[PDB]
């Protein structure tokens, strides 16, 4: 119906070619996923040669990663901020490859606190002392220090990172096609990208 033909469209000279063969099943469209954020709705689509293709509508979880220290945990996908293909897609909260979105930022802290033995940015130390100090202080004899010594000075954590934990959000990059895969996935922004997209955000809105 809606098709992805190539026997339409002008040649280089501005010429036209007269109608040749009728539309066929291997040149075919099928309308866009237009996936949002919400409760999971998945549809299974039969596709050529078999080998079913998953189309995801309204995901709310993706597997992001923090490849700086190589941990990857499942985290909720809150809202869109920047979509580098169009401005309109952000307004209706459409989710596609290479967007910039927000997450809860929760397990990354839990991992950091247990492994590097330090909290991130904090409102107050009063919260920590009755519980959440129980993990941070430890009763080991022998391997209070012995393990943790090797973790020291490999946890400088950068300025633009640390400030974001306090808000409870982090900026990560969709590196999947949700409409073809059936899953959202990605990597979290680091380095110069994370400097770049801040400037685009503050430029465009506000």
């Amino acid at each position: 119906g809606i098709s992805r033909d190539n026997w339409h469209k002008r040649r280089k000279t501005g010429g036209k070619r007269k109608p040749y063969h009728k539309k066929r099943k291997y040149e075919l469209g099928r309308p866009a996923a237009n996936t949002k954020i919400g409760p999971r709705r998945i549809h299974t689509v039969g596709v050529r040669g078999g080998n079913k293709k998953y189309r995801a509508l309204r995901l709310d979880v993706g597997n992001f990663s923090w490849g700086s220290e190589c941990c990857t945990r499942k985290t909720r996908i809150i809202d869109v901020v920047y979509n580098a293909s169009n401005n309109e897609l952000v307004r209706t909260k459409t989710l596609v490859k290479n967007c910039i979105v927000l997450i809860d930022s929760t397990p990354y802290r839990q991992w950091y606190e247990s492994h590097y033995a330090l909290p991130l940015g904090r409102k107050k130390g009063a919260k920590l002392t009755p519980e959440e100090e129980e993990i941070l202080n430890k009763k080991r004899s022998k391997k209070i220090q012995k393990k943790y010594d090797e973790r020291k000075k490999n946890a400088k954590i950068s300025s633009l990172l640390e400030e974001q934990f306090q808000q409870g959000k982090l900026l990560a990059c969709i590196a999947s096609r949700p409409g073809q895969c059936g899953r959202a996935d990605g990597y979290v922004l680091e380095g110069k990208e994370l400097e770049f997209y801040l400037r685009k955000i503050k430029a465009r809105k506000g």
Partner: protein
């Protein structure tokens, strides 16, 4: 080089990561970027200029994804007025067997040109090679540029 972004998106090479390990350079140092390149094979050699320089392009074969496989051809420059591509020409001779004469015919083709080559001028010989499609009228990329023909680009004392 220090600016290579003018898009609404960030530009970078695949197969590159930015580590956050160690901290001590003093003033400056590693630009926090190792360069990516690869061999092309077939007796063609990567330019020094590619490995030196900084550009992000995915359609050149010295950096980005695209193979050269199948045919290899030549041509000549005729025009450049487009960004990251050129136009070229192929002069050749068509024979007729009723007569015993030939006649001239030419075709024109576009082909993509790397930001690596920037010494191109209109009238240089160029070499190209078969590739997977990049665009509607581009199927090729440059492998090499040369000048080795009459009325050279600069005075003889080389």
């Amino acid at each position: 080089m220090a600016d290579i972004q003018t898009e609404r998106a960030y530009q970078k090479q695949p197969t590159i990561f930015q580590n956050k390990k160690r901290v001590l350079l003093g003033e400056t140092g590693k630009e926090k970027l190792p360069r990516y390149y690869k061999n092309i094979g077939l007796g063609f050699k990567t330019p020094k200029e590619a490995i030196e320089g900084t550009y992000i392009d995915k359609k050149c074969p010295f950096t980005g994804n695209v193979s050269i496989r199948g045919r290899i051809l030549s041509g000549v420059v005729t025009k450049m007025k487009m960004q990251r591509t050129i136009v070229i020409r192929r002069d050749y001779l068509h024979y007729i067997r009723k007569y015993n004469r030939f006649e001239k015919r030419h075709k024109n083709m576009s082909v993509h040109l790397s930001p690596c080559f920037r010494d191109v001028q209109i009238g240089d010989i160029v070499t190209v090679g078969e590739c997977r499609p990049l665009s509607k009228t581009v199927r090729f990329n440059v492998l090499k540029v040369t000048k080795a023909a009459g009325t050279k680009k600069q005075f003889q004392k080389f």
